[PDB]
Amino acid sequence: TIRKGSEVEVSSTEEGFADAWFRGILQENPKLRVRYLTLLNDDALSPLIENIEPRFIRPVPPENEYNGIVLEEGTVVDADHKDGWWTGVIIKKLENGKFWVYYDSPPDIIEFERNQLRPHLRWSGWKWLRPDIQELDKSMFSSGTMAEVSTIVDKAEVAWFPAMIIKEIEVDGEKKFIVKDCNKHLSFSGDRTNSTIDSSRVRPTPPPFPVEKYELMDRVEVFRGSVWRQGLVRGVLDHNCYMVCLVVTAAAPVVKHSDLRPCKVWEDGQTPV
């Protein structure tokens, strides 16, 4: 029932585009001529028309066809890129109402507001179809799971670095993890690639250890710079505070109880050393 004025969604012919649907305005009544709704477009300059197989064309799904579907973990959804919709799976619903959506090429995880999402639907050429809810991995290092990545500072120090696990892949029989640094402030121009990292470099987030007291000399881990670094409790200070010094030696600054971690390690189970 497409008409000349109809907004329309056109499928991606190209690689790395498998899961997109672009916004367009059809210029024809039944290849077909479409003008793409693009960002940074002033209507002042004459639009550009591309010709598409009706094969790669579908109508915009009407709201009533998908307004009944609830957004939960495993729900296939589309994210509004304004000029287009990008399809992925919801892997976390946060209590604040935000969502974490996964994409598989390149593998990435993005946080969205509810308004930026719609449930995904498929056009048969005849009618709309609801996709199945997707089973989710909740393994130890499932996607979205927060872990720590080993790093070396300068010559020899072993520092641990918080990162989200995007995907676990195998490369030539070697377990690898694609990981994301969730602590960087990115600009709009900045919004960027995840790094692939050997399995040996990745460990779980250390479970919490309450201590309630620390004693001088203790090996301890404090988050300095933006990595966890090893240190020794030089001083015990008024009320709950400590003077910590890192194993490379520079100076000692005050630290609070909260910011200290029992220095722990993971080799099979989790143990000191």
Question: What is the spatial distance between Cα 137 and Cα 174, in angstroms, rounded to a whole number?
Answer: 20
Identical fold, 63-129 and 219-271: yes
Q: CATH number of the domain at 63-129, please?
A: 2.30.30.140
Task: Note whether 182 and 205 are within 8 A (CB).
Answer: no
Resolution in A: 2.6
Task: Note whether 211 and 250 are within 8 A (CB).
Answer: no
- For 67, counting Cβ atoms within 10 Å of its Cβ (0-12 exposed, 13-18 middle, 19+ buried), the class is exposed
3-state secondary structure of 130: coil
3-state secondary structure of 50: strand
Phi and psi angles of residue 167, each rounded to the nearest 5 degrees, phi first? -155, 145
| Architecture of the domain spanning 219-271 | Roll (2.30)
Q: Which long-range contacts (CB under 8 A, 24 or more apart) does 111-118 make?
A: 112/79, 114/71, 115/80, 116/79, 116/80, 117/71, 117/77, 117/78, 117/79, 117/80, 117/90, 118/61, 118/66, 118/77, 118/78, 118/80, 118/85
Nearest to 166 by CA among 197, 120, 191: 197
3-state secondary structure 221-271: EEEECCEEEEEEEEEEECCCEEEEEECCCCCCCEEECCCEEECCEECCCEE
From residue 102, give the alpha-carbon distance in Å to each of 17, 109, 160, 247.
Answer: 15, 5, 25, 39
Q: CATH number of the domain at 146-204, please?
A: 2.30.30
Residues with Cβ within 8 Å of residue 19, at least 6 apart in sequence: 12, 86, 87, 88, 103, 104, 105
Nearest to 217 by CA among 231, 203, 204: 231
- For 30, counting Cβ atoms within 10 Å of its Cβ (0-12 exposed, 13-18 middle, 19+ buried), the class is exposed
Interruption sites in the chain after residues (C→N beyond 2.5 Å) = 30, 191
Task: Note whether 66 and 85 are within 8 A (CB).
Answer: no
Nearest to 202 by CA among 153, 151, 150, 162: 150
Nearest to 226 by CA among 159, 132, 179, 175: 159
Q: How determined?
A: X-ray
Residue boundaries of the structural domains of the chain? 7-59, 63-129, 146-204, 219-271
